[PDB]
Design a protein around this ligand. Structure first.
Ligand SMILES: O=C(NCc1cccnc1)c1ccc(CNS(=O)(=O)c2ccc(F)cc2)cc1
Ligand SMILES: N[C@@H](CCC(=O)O)C(=O)O
Ligand SMILES: [Ca+2]
Lengths: 282, 276
């Protein structure tokens, strides 16, 4: 079938770039000298909240795009990639009536047929959608500027906060709902909800610019950022374990074979190859 | 509502004990083990035993959350699961051939098993790890010592416990390594660990979760997993259910709720943490 795939900008899983003048993608080589497989993805350009969204063709590539191509050729299907219009992962928010936003909203409203992005498996999302077996096992860590002394999650500058040390996550993401629903994490959520960022990139930028002192997010992203920017470090190891899965509607006929392909890929090394290509270098 | 459940002893996930003098006390639940009278008969007795561990505590929480009662028994037809002559033994086989509603234990999720049973969401990250004596230089599974063993004089001595998901993966991915290492097949984890420490073996390739548990509680911290306790072919332990089972939806949601509520971390803290 012709599957409408939804994704999100999130390095090194999905890099988003403008096309050249002729609407094509510039040829690139990986860290290993192999050519980069790029797809055309449509998505909005302006990232200012409460503004009109003008969709344009763009170039998508990365860990998740190679996974898409592998799944597509393994299960023999065609696709169209688009970027989530609101630029969010997805949470269920109260408007009595509760509505889904982000990729979750696009999948449930029929705007997308499949989520191929670093989307965390959780209780909330699993009630409404089918998740594949995880394509990546990881968790939560904390990103700080080199020099910022922080122990981890049990540090007094997070457990007993003030306006002197600002920390945050990404709005309407799984990290955000994790802190919201956990009563032990209540004091932290109260601080974070005044400071959360629209996107992971803006938060990473804010930590470099000394505007945000700590960014709480996925270790697969934060460890990659710290491996690329020498002014950034992660603090401690994982304080909470989580994994990324492919998302489909519960009525999807691709459910069984999406998961078998994923299991197959971890077992034969394809998943390790993706990590060698996109995640682990420098 | 009253479900037959199969399990297998593999500490700290499932620990088997004798009944106290006169039933199962404290953090333990009743489990039954069919024990044969002799080998010139098919007759046997169901010995009342007691079960505990990380996987048993998950089963307790699932029992109260999903609302079901159960009769827990220990597999006697092999272990975890192996497809012999296109027929499944172990916990997998007990579920495939409908002798059990579900399998709970240190049961690895893999592709061939997922074709015949349904697995819940993973609740323990696992895969393949390598256990060596501290200081041993092996890059990983793809190290030449493993890949082309006879290029070394003397060759590197390494083995696994056969018939599990680890040997299966090795057989499929590294034919030469596999045929060389069958000479070093170990009966169980305890035998392998003794073999490493006494210098009878150089590496033991096995389940990441059990290896990292054993490395953490090792006397003197002599035995380590290679890399940062690196995992190849990352997967998880899951609950095996029958294909199209009406229990899956509620089992997955309850496990994901334990993750989100903080209950999984308390279980990891009690049962899995070590010194090293
Ligand atoms: O904390 C979890 N288990 C305890 C544990 C102890 C030692 C090693 N690994 C996991 C857990 C379970 C399920 C999910 C959600 N599902 S998942 O498949 O994305 C997954 C991610 C990471 C995991 F470690 C296990 C499963 C998250 C966390
Ligand atoms: N957890 C493994 C145990 C044996 C192995 O590591 O091969 C299984 O279910 O087969
Ligand atoms: Ca479809």
């Amino acid at each position: 079938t012709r599957l409408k795939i939804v994704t999100i900008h999130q390095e090194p899983f999905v890099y988003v770039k403008p096309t050249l003048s002729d609407g094509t993608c510039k040829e690139e080589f990986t860290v290993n000298g192999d050519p980069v497989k790029k797809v055309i993805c449509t998505g909005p350009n302006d990232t200012s909240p409460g503004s009109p969204r003008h969709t344009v063709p763009q170039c998508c590539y990365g860990f998740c795009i190679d996974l898409l191509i592998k799944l597509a050729r393994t299960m023999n299907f065609t696709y169209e990639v688009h970027l989530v219009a609101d630029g969010k992962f997805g949470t269920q928010e109260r408007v009595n009536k509760k509505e889904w936003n982000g990729m979750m909203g696009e999948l449930l409203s029929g705007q997308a047929d499949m989520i191929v992005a670093p989307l965390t498996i959780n209780n909330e999302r699993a009630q409404y959608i089918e998740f594949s077996k995880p394509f990546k096992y990881q968790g939560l860590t904390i990103l700080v500027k080199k020099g910022t002394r922080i122990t981890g999650i049990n540090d007094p500058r997070l457990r007993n906060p003030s306006d002197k040390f600002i920390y945050a996550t990404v709005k309407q993401s799984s990290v955000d709902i994790y802190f919201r629903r956990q009563v032990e994490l209540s004091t932290m959520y109260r601080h974070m909800e005044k400071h959360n960022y629209e996107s992971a990139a803006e938060a990473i930028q804010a930590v470099r610019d000394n505007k945000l002192h700590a960014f709480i997010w996925d270790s697969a992203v934060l460890e990659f950022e710290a491996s690329q920017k020498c002014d950034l470090v992660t603090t401690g190891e994982l304080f909470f374990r989580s994994g990324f899965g492919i998302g489909m509607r519960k009525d999807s006929p691709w459910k069984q074979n999406v998961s078998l392909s994923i299991l197959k890929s971890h077992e034969n090394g394809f998943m390790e190859d993706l990590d060698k290509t996109w995640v682990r270098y420098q | 509502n009253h479900l037959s459940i199969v399990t297998l002893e593999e500490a700290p996930f499932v620990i088997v004990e004798d009944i106290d003098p006169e039933t199962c006390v404290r953090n333990t639940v009743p489990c039954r083990k069919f024990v044969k009278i002799n080998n010139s008969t098919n007759e046997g007795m169901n010995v009342k035993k007691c079960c505990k561990g990380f996987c048993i505590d998950i089963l307790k929480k699932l029992s109260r959350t999903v609302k079901f009662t159960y009769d827990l028994y220990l597999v006697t037809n092999g272990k975890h699961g192996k497809k012999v002559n296109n027929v499944w033994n172990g916990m997998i086989g007990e579920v495939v051939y409908q002798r059990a509603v579900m399998a709970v234990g240190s049961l690895t999720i893999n592709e061939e098993r997922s074709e015949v049973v349904d697995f819940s969401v993973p609740f323990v990250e696992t895969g393949i790890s390598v256990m060596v004596s501290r200081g041993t230089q092996v890059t990983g599974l793809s190290d030449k010592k493993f890949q082309r063993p006879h290029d070394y004089s003397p060759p590197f001595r390494f083995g696994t416990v056969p018939n599990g998901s680890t040997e299966r993966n090795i057989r499929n991915n590294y034919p030469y390594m596999h045929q060389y290492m069958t000479k070093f097949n170990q009966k169980g984890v305890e035998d392998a660990l003794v073999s490493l420490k006494t210098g009878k073996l150089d590496a033991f390739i096995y389940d990441a979760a059990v290896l990292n548990y054993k490395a953490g509680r090792d006397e003197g911290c002599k035995l380590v997993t290679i890399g940062s306790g690196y995992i190849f072919a990352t997967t998880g332990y899951g609950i095996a259910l029958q294909k199209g089972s009406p229990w899956k939806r509620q089992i997955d949601l309850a496990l994901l709720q334990f993750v989100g509520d903080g209950e999984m971390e308390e279980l990891e803290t009690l049962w899995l943490t070590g010194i090293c």
